[PDB]
Amino acid sequence: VTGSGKKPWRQKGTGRARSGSIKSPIWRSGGVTFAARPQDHSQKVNKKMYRGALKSILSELVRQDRLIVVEKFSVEAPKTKLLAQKLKDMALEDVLIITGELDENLFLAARNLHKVDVRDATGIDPVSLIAFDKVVMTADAVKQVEEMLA
Amino acid sequence: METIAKHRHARSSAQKVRLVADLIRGKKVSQALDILTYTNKKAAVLVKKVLESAIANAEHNDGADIDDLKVTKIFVDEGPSMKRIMPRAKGRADRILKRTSHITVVVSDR
């Protein structure tokens, strides 16, 4: 804290409490007894534990029929309107599209759709699977999952 | 009628003015006016001016016939105080409070 180490007043004779510095934490305008510092909150998770949780999550999605497997999922042109129509007739509004190969055409179509996400099998995280109401996996996307999950 | 009238930020202290206020509380305006006229206090002329204003407000903005008016309510409230530094002996300093007050007078014909 900006200031000086000079004692505000003498140790004895003054009728008020002993003080040592203007920057003491019990003083106005300067203090904070335990000041925070920039810290890393990331924690270690074992590889097997990460895989086990991912396997556990996928199984339960299948059990709650929240996971739908279909053939290749693609859009002819990079238009959000087309993607909205394709998801409308399927009665899906909050979906996570997982495809084996990432194509810019599908990536751009879903960019402006908040409730819709497009992802690759490699870039799969537990939070996304849990958060999204429905998960749609392509045939290719499914295959890569077992290979990486093993 | 209400026909209130107040004077805010009077320099006189609330305690000192409050002695004069108690004299005329509940009395008719005619008796209140000459009571203040012959009261030897600074607060007397402050309160009298407020009472004159209240009577004028009733006469102009409200019904006439100010003869039958009475001071139904009168109270003095402490106002903002000005802090001043007054040197004392041995280099010490002390705070002088210039106390103000709000004088409120309410007159009605009933």
């Binding site: 505000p8 007043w9 004779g13 | 041995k90 280099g91 010490r92 300093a93």
Partner: peptide, 17 residues
């Protein structure tokens, strides 16, 4: 509000020894 910049220095009238 303001700490008196000067603190008077007293004396010991009563030794009390």
């Amino acid at each position: 509000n303001n700490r008196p910049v000067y603190i008077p220095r007293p004396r010991p009238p009563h030794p009390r020894l």
